[PDB]
Design a protein around this ligand. Structure first.
Ligand SMILES: [Zn+2]
Lengths: 12, 233, 43
DNA sequence: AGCAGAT
DNA sequence: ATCTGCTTTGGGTGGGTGGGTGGGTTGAGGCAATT
């Protein structure tokens, strides 16, 4: 019931 | 040979050459653009000299340098009391006694921004004191919006200084209190004169609006004047 | 620009048709590719 | 009243 | 795009647990040092 977006450090 | 960049130019030499009478008048009437084209022409001829003369001097070093011209003796020096609104954005000559000089002010040239989710940085130039800060990273992979921060110590700054000038005794008609005009000097003219010196200053008589308060964008109808110096003697 | 940000040089570029657009910046005063790049970026 | 924010 | 809401100038109709390196500056009275 949540809309969560994830970001990754490897993309830095 | 000496590695310097500033070229001291005398106005009359423009009147000496048949071609440049109109250039001299334009300099006296539109100093900013004329000085800009003069600077670029100086740089272009500097590089062209080496290109044509196939000298051993390094070209990359020349390409790195900012080049300038410092006109002087642009007409009979006027008086601080004779500066009317007709002279706004026009080259003038002032003879006055220095009275004070503020410490060097860091003036921003290029802003530096960094992302908080990709650590991507790009420098964005400045135009008339407004930062064109981006709404999202220029990286296609990370297009996250409104994730820009200003790293103050990684920007680029230029030297500015504000001087106060007071007129010479002989210009006082009766003996009243001499008036005072404010100047602004940039780059190599910074700290070019000490307090109590008699100097002749050539610059553009500019005028800037003043905000009514440090909260809103309302400006006072009265405009404040100053001089944008390009040469000091 | 060699001069400071507040020097204040204004431009008028002429389109193929007789209309004049306004650009700000010494680099624009000298060059045309820079003028068009600034025109695109200012949008 | 101009500008700073939440629906 | 519209609705909701705070705060000025500068001044005591905000104050002294914000101070005087944030500005509102003469007048009087007490104290140490100079005489
Ligand atoms: Zn990013």
């Amino acid at each position: 019931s949540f809309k969560s977006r994830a970001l990754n450090h490897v993309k830095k | 040979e000496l590695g310097t960049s500033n070229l001291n130019l005398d106005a009359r030499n423009l009147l000496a050459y048949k071609q440049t009478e109109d250039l001299y008048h334009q300099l006296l009437n539109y100093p900013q653009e004329v000085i800009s084209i003069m600077d670029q022409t100086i740089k272009d001829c500097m590089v062209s000299l080496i290109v044509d003369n196939n000298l051993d001097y390094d070209l990359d070093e020349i390409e790195t340098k900012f080049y300038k011209v410092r006109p002087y003796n642009v007409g009979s020096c006027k008086g601080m009391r004779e500066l009317n609104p007709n002279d706004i954005d026009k080259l003038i000559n002032l003879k006055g006694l220095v009275l004070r000089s503020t410490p060097v002010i860091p003036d921003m040239k290029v802003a530096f921004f960094k992302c908080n989710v990709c650590d991507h940085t790009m420098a964005v130039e400045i135009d008339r004191g407004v930062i064109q800060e981006p709404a999202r990273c220029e990286r296609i992979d990370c297009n996250e919006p409104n994730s820009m921060s200003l790293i103050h110590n990684r920007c680029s700054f230029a030297d500015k200084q504000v001087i106060k000038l007071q007129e010479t005794p002989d210009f006082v008609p009766d003996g009243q209190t001499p008036h005072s005009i404010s100047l602004c000097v940039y780059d190599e003219l910074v700290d070019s004169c000490r307090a109590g010196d008699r100097i002749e200053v050539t610059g553009t008589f500019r005028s800037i609006p003043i905000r009514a308060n440090s909260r809103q964008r309302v400006l006072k109808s009265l405009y404040k004047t100053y001089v944008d110096v390009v040469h000091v003697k | 620009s060699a001069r400071h940000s507040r020097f204040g040089g204004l431009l008028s570029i002429q389109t193929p048709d007789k209309t004049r657009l306004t650009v700000s910046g010494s680099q624009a005063l000298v060059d045309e590719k820079i003028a068009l790049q600034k025109l695109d970026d200012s949008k």
